[PDB]
A paper describes a structure:
Here, we present the cryo-EM structure of CalA3, a chain release PKS module without an ACP domain, and its structures with amidation or hydrolysis products. The domain organization reveals a unique “∞”-shaped dimeric architecture with five connected domains. The catalytic region tightly contacts the structural region, resulting in two stabilized chambers with nearly perfect symmetry while the N-terminal docking domain is flexible. The ~360 kDa megaenzyme uses only the KS domain to catalyze one C–N bond formation (or hydrolysis) and subsequently release the polyketide chain.
Author numbering:
A (entry chain B): 967 to 1719
B (entry chain A): 50 to 966
C (entry chain B): 146 to 242
D (entry chain B): 291 to 338
């Protein structure tokens, strides 16, 4: 969102103050800069100011006022007390070259990146730093030709020069912050083409500053500049981005879907599979094509083609690392790794029907593999291919298999935690024959950086994240049927209270709080706001990990109350963890702990037929899990699994949905905003839970019976999201695939070129 | 958006005048309340990327420049001229345009980028300049203004330029867009508009004029030059005149006399006589007096000379669409052109009865109050335009029928395949053309549609080809393209500009590798090409009837009816393979496929050398038959061969290091994973057993593939040196690579009898040859796969070359598609799709193909305007009381205050009393 | 002739008796129309624009009209007046002068 | 009269177009280029 710079507000007061006089020296004191002056893109602004002279000699009082919000009224946006004609001497020729002596130089490009990681960006007329030095509790800088209209000569250059002092005062801090007050500002003449700034944080929570000419003359001074009382004011209400529906859409590669060449003699390919014959056959195909390769399988299977047997099935990366280290001792050079998953063939092979335990087995194995191998040869910049089967939503080949979900989480974890490595996820059809390995590695090597690809029939698809408007007015028209009960489940009290308030605001007459806290905590406040419209309210104190307590929720609604019509499993926290810090045993334990609750409930309600009698059954997940994020492996895995599980029931005709939401605004902690600060810098903004529920809940009657893919609903700026974190090579989920063969002419009227 | 859309409106008797446009930024208050006019909807939307314009310049351009630019492309497309073929032509341009005031929409000073484009974006004289720049035209390029007559003046000047021989083509028309409301406000303020906005042309109900918008361009040529180039003709403009009302006493009508003069001047210019005109598309703007004067001037000219029983028929399209201002004469032409084609004269709308301000009583002129038939026949059909203006520049044109549209005398044929070819500047515009075209293929002849598409349309970056025999197959292919869903009838892709292409020539005998179910079917498919492609039939017989004399006429039977011998190491097989390779090369070059390098495997090197231009065709057959007889001695010899699934360095080391190797050697090195060994049948079989003991696969046994003795060498060198010395070698047009060396061939090497024997003193090094083609930049790679499946070893050696993940296209020309022509057309369709400039004419040659009309390009339009669209008009409120003025809102004020500035012209309006002056 | 923008000199709105004459007073097509009205001439009257070549183009067409026998005399030329400063400002802003 | 059209600036589009229009004007008038004594060029003062 556009805002008026604090240096421009501080100049605006001075421009009003000096208006009536030719005098070249000034002082302002007791300055206030309340609020933020802002204007949504494409809107008019009206400004007003007054010199409300107190009659106390020097003491003109200056005010500045911003316009009414819509049909509202004028509001103060700055004020200062003037003291003209400063009439005292000051130090002279204070050597500018003596200023940097204690201090280390920084690159101006990193300075403007630091400020961009404080939410703040600047147009070229305010990118006026030229050199910067910093150390301890002070900074100094060289400021460039701040060539504002009436600035090279005339005073308007003070807007830019004062904004540079604010840029340095912010640079020493942390968390997004903006000026609130200045105790004194003292000024003499307009600034020279070159000036030197010094800024010092010696005071308690406040900064002082001096501006010198290129000769070391005192041009201005500032005392008691404060920013901290507007550090961390709500970025959610300030950000430009609307509430929208975000979807991972598979696009066919109809144009340009020809594989092209493979890298030849620049290394060799490691091929791991659950099936020794597959790894063998793909090494044979690579050998026919003259590409050197090695076949690997787990110690669960024999050396059926002289294949390397790898201690995967142990959760430990280090025995796997030692296993590849023997290959490096043979002198092996790696171009890349291909990991091939068996697909649904684990079901007849084991005889089991245990999707959560199957996910725990898969993830545990594959982590030990990928970590163990990265620990040994990541220095070679190896390419990585993770080949799933039947993981992809939104495509032919029947419903996705939820047990595959650890592979997509593991892929996006590599995308954000090892962004130097080019890598891809390929999803095969689980029942068709796999394509030629040359088609895989050829089609993959089209990609610099990273992407998700899928194959069905002879046809190639690429996933793109794309966005469309979200009609919240459907939720205004959704009257929840009055002859019915609704469940709110699993959430903390903050989410529960907001969901309960939304249910009451939508005419829900009967509700059960199926929370663990619900019948043991002080939920009398929740009952009070609920009974503003809920006639019948009940509480369970359910442990969702317990099949018996979940069976108590299934004994409810069967207990003759108004019949069940909606269920909402609310958001839950999940522990942080990257690929580092993690191992396969730890992953299995944490993923099982994360998923057991919503799995056992959704299962039991479907087994007893409360599902499908229900009109709206909703599972919570994060929108962040769509492109994924660094350091959240298990949270991503759980979100992916619930997304697939929801679709498995949806393709069975049931109204189960996984919602991938942004952070709920009511869940932003007032005590420590840091989680929401981290999201806000990453371009994810909180929103009211009731508005997201309004935009979502009536929609399942529309069908979208395949083409929806993975879907979510949030306020996000994907350009901030992509440029936050860090990534050198493109990522085709967020970004357009490539440039292509066209160029442009000099155009009409040009005698040039 | 076309003549047929205007005809559908006019022939159904509709009208198009309506309410004011939304979405133009017009600040207009009640001043236009209840006004109606004929607007173009969506005039603010344009496609900058199609024309190569930057969207900020496209916002700066006057809508009139945009409509001329858009309409000109469409005029070339309906002339059936590729606009890329118009570049560098002596085409002149004459555009009727007026300054529309478009920059005056801005509420605020422009951004510094758009500011620099406003000049050429809005100059009138820049409009014709921008057309001639965009289309690369070299004739004169002028804009003209005479208000309402500006289009008829542009047509007159273009006709006079063509008759004076200044230019080969002329491109004439105009545009009119009300980007600002001011002309409507003025005509409403002065009460000139009819109150319902209808121009009731020549009716007793006449009320006033009615304003409207439009644009149009005609492409014009001298009829003799049009006919000898075979262009379509929509109508003939036969004669033209302009004059001026001037001024006079006004008791004589200046307009009455001036209209009578201009009619006679136009008839004399056309060398026609007034009795031979059937109809006039009159002005008839709907002013009460002017319509009477016009009808009077027709009565005193045409109305005096009528044939018996033939009244002049009068009407005006301004009754259907309003006045249209500067383009009025284009609208009249488009009606008359469509009336000639449909053989009917349309009704005139809103006539209650003929206007009383003229004496209809003679019966020699009547209004078209009902539509009338106008059949082609013995009497040549002709009609006239009038166009008039208050500043007095009048004009008249005479139109005439096209010459007789003589039919093709069209032959009967079997349903040989048709390739439809489509292209667009973006993928969505490709699928739009597939939808538009489906409504045509379901009605027109598929061969005529196909023959039109490859020649009357430009070729862009996004491409598709649809193959079929039946109308239903082509419709199914287009439906799949439109749905963005894959089907085997079609090919999709994007043109790489890079040309670099190479062509691979096989010898006969390598079908001994065992894929004879394909390597016999390739030759049977090549027989099928003789029926489908005339260039193949001619080329094959020009080998066969020329050079079967070297073998006796038995080889002609083998060429006409190929079989297993064509895949086998024999004189007949080698000759047949050379003939069919030569015929395919001549076919592909007739499709304008040009190789940038050639490579030939074994005896196929003679064909590759012939294709590189290094020999005559006769030298080729002499050398091939010599190598054929040498090949017989080898293939009938006591030795054997095998393939092993082991690479050259594996086999060569194991062979050389062991014994039981006696006389076995590496014969070929063509793909990384296998090599071929030949020599003594004992050692050869024992080398194969040795490799099976190492667990490798082997294919075995087969005949020998190398000279088994220096005896055979000395016999072969005696046979070759005599023949090789006689061959008329010359240096190649394009680099020729040899499978003897894996390298390019030098002039002395080409001439060496040793080099030609080294095909038998191997190994063959096809792997190194294909690897060198890719180092040397070859992007796409074509197999003459009549035997040995030559593209297969090419793909397996090419694809593993090296790092960059490069493009690589492999095409097999005598391929596996079931109707024999579809394999070749599919392979060509894939090359054309990837970017080769293929000449499709060979698919349509020797067939009853005619040009037919087609849809025009589907622009992917977006808003381009200097200002955002207005909010809902409910915002407006009453003006301030003139000397009380604006109420202020000084924030802390204790009671309200107001101010006014009166500028000097307002002061004299408010201060309505004078004291002492 | 090229459109000079002359009426854009006004700050106030015009008096109605001026307003009624601004149309034919400033239309480029009307420039050749006035001459043939004032002198009572009966041949075709055309205003042309091609930037700086507008005069030589007007003269070329008049030579063709006389050779074709369209008229007895022809009267060919042009005018250019900087009634507004804006074209000098553009050429000065872009440093073309 | 002619246009200079549009093409690559390296081949001097204005230069070629000026050579064509001179030859066309001579061919219209039936005169020959040796029979001309002087030319009143454009010579506007732009450096190239």
């Amino acid at each position: 969102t556009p805002v008026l710079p604090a240096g421009a507000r501080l100049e605006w007061l001075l421009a009003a103050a000096r208006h009536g006089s030719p005098d070249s020296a000034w002082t302002l004191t007791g300055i206030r800069l309340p609020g933020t002056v802002s204007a949504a893109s494409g809107t008019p602004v009206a400004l007003q100011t007054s010199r409300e002279d107190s009659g106390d000699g020097h003491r003109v009082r200056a005010f500045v006022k911003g316009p009414g919000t819509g049909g509202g009224r004028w509001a103060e946006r700055g004020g200062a007390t003037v003291v003209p004609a400063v009439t005292r001497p000051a130090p002279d020729r204070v050597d500018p070259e003596s200023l940097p002596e204690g201090l280390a130089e920084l690159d101006v490009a990193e300075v403007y990146r630091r400020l961009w990681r404080q939410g703040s960006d600047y147009a070229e007329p305010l990118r006026v730093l030229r050199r910067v030095w910093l150390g301890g509790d002070e900074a100094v800088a060289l400021v460039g030709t701040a060539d504002v209209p009436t600035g090279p000569s005339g005073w308007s250059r003070w807007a830019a020069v004062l904004e540079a002092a604010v840029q340095l005062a912010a640079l020493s801090g942390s968390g997004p912050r903006t000026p609130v007050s200045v105790d004194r500002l003292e000024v003499s003449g307009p600034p020279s083409e070159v000036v030197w700034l010094r800024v010092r944080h010696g005071a308690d929570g406040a900064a002082d500053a001096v501006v010198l000419s290129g000769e070391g003359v005192r041009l201005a001074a500032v005392q008691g500049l404060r920013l901290r009382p507007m550090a961390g004011r709500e970025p959610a209400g300030l950000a430009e981005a609307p509430l929208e529906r975000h979807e991972v859409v598979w696009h066919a590669l109809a144009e340009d879907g020809r594989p092209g060449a493979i890298g030849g003699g620049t290394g060799s390919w490691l091929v791991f599979s659950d099936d020794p014959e597959r790894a063998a056959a793909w090494c044979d195909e690579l050998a026919l094509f003259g590409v050197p390769a090695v076949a690997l399988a787990g110690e669960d299977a024999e050396g059926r083609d002289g294949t390397e047997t790898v201690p995967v099935g142990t959760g430990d990366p280090d025995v796997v690392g030692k296993t590849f280290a023997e290959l490096r001792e043979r002198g092996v050079t790696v171009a890349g790794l291909l990991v091939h998953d068996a697909g649904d063939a684990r079901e007849p092979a084991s005889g089991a029907d245990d999707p959560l335990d199957a996910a725990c087995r898969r993830g545990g194995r594959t982590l030990a593999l990928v970590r163990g191998f990265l620990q040994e040869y990541a220095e070679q910049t190896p390419r990585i291919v993770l080949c799933s089967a039947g993981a992809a939503a939104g495509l032919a080949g029947g419903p996705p298999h939820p047990a595959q979900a650890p592979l997509t989480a593991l892929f996006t974890s590599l995308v954000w935690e090892h962004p130097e490595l080019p890598c891809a996820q390929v999803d095969l059809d689980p029942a068709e024959d796999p394509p030629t390995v040359v088609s895989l590695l050829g089609q993959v090597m089209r990609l610099p950086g990273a992407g998700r690809l899928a194959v069905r029939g002879g046809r190639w698809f690429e996933a793109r994240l794309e966005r469309r408007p979200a009609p919240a007015d459907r939720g205004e028209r959704l009257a929840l049927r009055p002859d019915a009960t609704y469940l709110v489940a699993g959430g903390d009290t903050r989410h529960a209270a907001a969901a309960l308030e939304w249910l009451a605001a939508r005419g829900a007459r009967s509700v059960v709080l199926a929370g663990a806290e619900s019948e043991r905590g002080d939920l009398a406040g929740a009952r009070t706001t609920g009974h503003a419209g809920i006639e019948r309210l009940e509480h369970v104190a359910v442990d969702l990990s317990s099949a018996a307590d979940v069976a108590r929720l299934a004994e409810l609604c069967a207990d003759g109350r108004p019949p069940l019509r909606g269920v909402l499993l609310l958001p839950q926290p999940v522990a942080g963890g990257g690929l580092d810090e993690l191992d396969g045993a730890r992953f299995g334990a944490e993923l099982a702990g994360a998923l057991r609750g919503p799995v056992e409930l959704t299962r039991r309600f479907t087994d007893v037929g409360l599902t499908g009698g229900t009109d709206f059954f909703v599972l919570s997940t994060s929108v962040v899990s769509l492109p994924g994020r660094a350091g959240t492996v298990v949270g991503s895995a759980a979100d992916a699994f619930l997304t697939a599980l929801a679709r498995h029931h949806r393709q069975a005709g049931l109204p189960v949905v996984a919602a991938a939401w942004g952070p709920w605004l009511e869940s932003v902690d007032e005590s420590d905003e840091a989680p929401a600060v981290a999201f806000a810098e990453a371009g994810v903004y909180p929103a009211p839970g009731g508005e997201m529920l309004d935009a979502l809940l009536p929609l399942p009657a529309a069908g979208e019976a395949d083409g929806s893919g993975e879907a979510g609903l949030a306020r996000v700026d994907w350009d901030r999201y992509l440029t936050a974190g860090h990534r050198p090579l493109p990522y085709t989920v967020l970004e357009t695939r490539a440039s292509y063969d066209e160029e442009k002419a000099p155009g009409f009227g040009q005698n040039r070129m | 958006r076309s003549p047929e859309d205007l005809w559908d409106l006019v022939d159904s008797g509709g009208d198009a005048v309506g309410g004011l446009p939304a979405g133009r930024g017009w600040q207009a208050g009640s001043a236009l309340d209840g006004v109606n006019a004929g607007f173009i909807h969506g005039v603010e939307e344009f496609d900058p990327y199609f024309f190569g314009l930057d969207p900020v310049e496209a916002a700066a351009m006057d809508p009139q420049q945009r409509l001329l630019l858009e309409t000109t492309w469409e005029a070339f497309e309906r002339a059936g001229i590729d606009p890329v073929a118009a570049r560098g032509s002596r085409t002149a341009v004459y555009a009727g345009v007026q300054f529309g005031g478009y920059p005056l929409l801005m509420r605020e000073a422009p951004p510094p980028q758009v500011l620099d484009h406003l000049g050429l974006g809005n100059s009138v004289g820049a409009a014709s300049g921008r057309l001639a720049y965009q289309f690369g035209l070299l004739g004169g390029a002028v804009t003209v203004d005479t208000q309402c007559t500006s289009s008829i003046v542009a047509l007159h000047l273009a006709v006079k330029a063509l008759r004076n021989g200044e230019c080969a083509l002329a491109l004439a028309g105009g545009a009119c867009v009300m980007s600002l409301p001011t002309v409507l406000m003025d005509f409403h303020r002065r009460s000139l508009l009819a109150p319902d906005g209808r121009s009731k042309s020549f009716a007793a109900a006449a009320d006033g004029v009615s304003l409207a918008e439009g644009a149009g361009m005609l492409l014009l040529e001298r009829l003799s030059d049009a006919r000898r180039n075979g262009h379509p003709v929509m109508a003939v403009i036969r004669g033209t005149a302009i004059n001026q009302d001037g001024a006079t006493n006004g008791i004589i009508s200046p307009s009455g006399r001036a209209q009578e003069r201009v009619i006679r001047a136009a008839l004399a210019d056309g060398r026609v006589t007034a009795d031979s005109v059937d109809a006039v598309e009159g002005h008839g703007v709907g002013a009460t007096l002017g319509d009477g004067v016009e009808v009077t001037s027709l009565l005193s000219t045409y109305g005096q000379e009528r044939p018996a029983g033939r009244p002049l028929l009068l009407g005006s399209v301004k009754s259907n669409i309003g006045h249209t201002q500067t383009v009025g004469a284009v609208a009249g032409i488009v009606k008359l052109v469509m009336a000639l084609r449909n053989e009917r004269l349309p009704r005139t709308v809103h006539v209650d009865g003929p206007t009383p301000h003229a004496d209809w009583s003679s019966g020699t002129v009547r209004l078209l109050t009902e539509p009338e038939p106008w059949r082609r026949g013995e009497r040549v059909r002709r009609a006239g335009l009038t166009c008039l203006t208050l500043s007095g520049t009048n004009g008249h044109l005479i139109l005439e029928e096209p010459p007789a549209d003589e039919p093709a005398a069209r032959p009967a044929n079997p349903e040989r395949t048709v390739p439809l070819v489509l292209s667009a500047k973006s993928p969505t515009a490709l699928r739009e053309q597939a939808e538009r075209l489906r409504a045509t293929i379901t009605a027109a002849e598929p061969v005529d549609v196909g023959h039109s598409l490859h020649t009357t349309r430009s070729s862009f970056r996004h491409r598709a080809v649809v193959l079929g025999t039946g109308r239903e197959e082509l419709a199914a292919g287009l439906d799949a393209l439109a749905g963005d869903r894959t089907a085997d009838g079609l090919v999709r892709g994007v043109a790489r500009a890079q040309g670099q292409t190479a062509l691979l020539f096989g010898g006969a005998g390598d079908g001994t590798s065992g894929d004879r179910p394909a390597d016999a079917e390739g030759p049977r498919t090549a027989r099928g090409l003789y029926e489908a492609f005339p260039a193949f039939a001619e080329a094959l017989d020009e080998v066969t009837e020329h050079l079967a004399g070297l073998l006796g006429p038995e080889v002609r039977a083998a060429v006409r009816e190929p079989g297993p011998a064509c895949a086998e190491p024999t004189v007949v097989g080698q000759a047949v393979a050379f003939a069919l390779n030569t015929a395919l090369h001549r076919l592909l070059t007739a499709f304008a496929v040009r190789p940038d390098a050639t490579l030939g495997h074994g005896a196929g090197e003679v064909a590759a050398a012939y294709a590189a231009g290094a020999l005559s065709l006769a030298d080729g057959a002499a050398l091939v038959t010599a190598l054929g007889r040498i090949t017989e001695r080898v293939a009938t010899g006591p030795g054997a061969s095998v393939w092993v699934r082991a690479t050259e360095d594996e086999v060569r080391a194991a062979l050389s290091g062991s014994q039981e190797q006696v006389g076995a050697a590496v014969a070929a090195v063509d793909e990384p994973g296998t090599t071929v060994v030949s020599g003594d049948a004992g050692a050869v079989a024992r080398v194969a057993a040795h490799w099976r003991a190492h667990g490798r696969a082997t294919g075995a046994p087969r005949p020998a593939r190398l000279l088994l003795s220096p005896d055979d060498e000395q016999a072969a060198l005696a046979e070759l040196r005599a023949i090789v010395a006689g061959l008329a070698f010359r240096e190649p047009e394009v680099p020729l690579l040899s499978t003897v060396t894996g390298q390019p061939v030098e002039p002395a090497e080409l001439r060496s009898a040793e080099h030609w024997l080294d095909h038998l003193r191997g190994p063959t090094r096809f792997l190194d040859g294909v690897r060198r083609l890719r180092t040397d930049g070859v992007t796409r790679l074509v197999g003459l796969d009549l035997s040995g499946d030559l593209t297969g070893p090419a793909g397996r050696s090419a694809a593993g070359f090296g790092e960059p993940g490069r493009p690589l296209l492999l095409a097999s020309v005598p391929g596996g598609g079931r109707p024999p022509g579809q394999a070749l057309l599919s392979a060509l369709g894939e090359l054309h799709t990837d970017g080769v400039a293929i000449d499709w004419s060979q698919a349509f040659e020797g067939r009853g193909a005619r040009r037919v009309d087609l849809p025009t390009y589907p622009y992917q339009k977006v808003r381009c305007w200097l200002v955002p669209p207005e909010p809902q008009v409910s915002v407006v409120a009453a003006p301030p009381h003139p000397l009380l003025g604006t109420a202020l809102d000084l924030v802390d004020a204790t009671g309200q205050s107001f101010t006014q500035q009166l500028t000097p012209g307002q002061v004299a309006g408010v201060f309505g009393q004078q004291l002492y002056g």
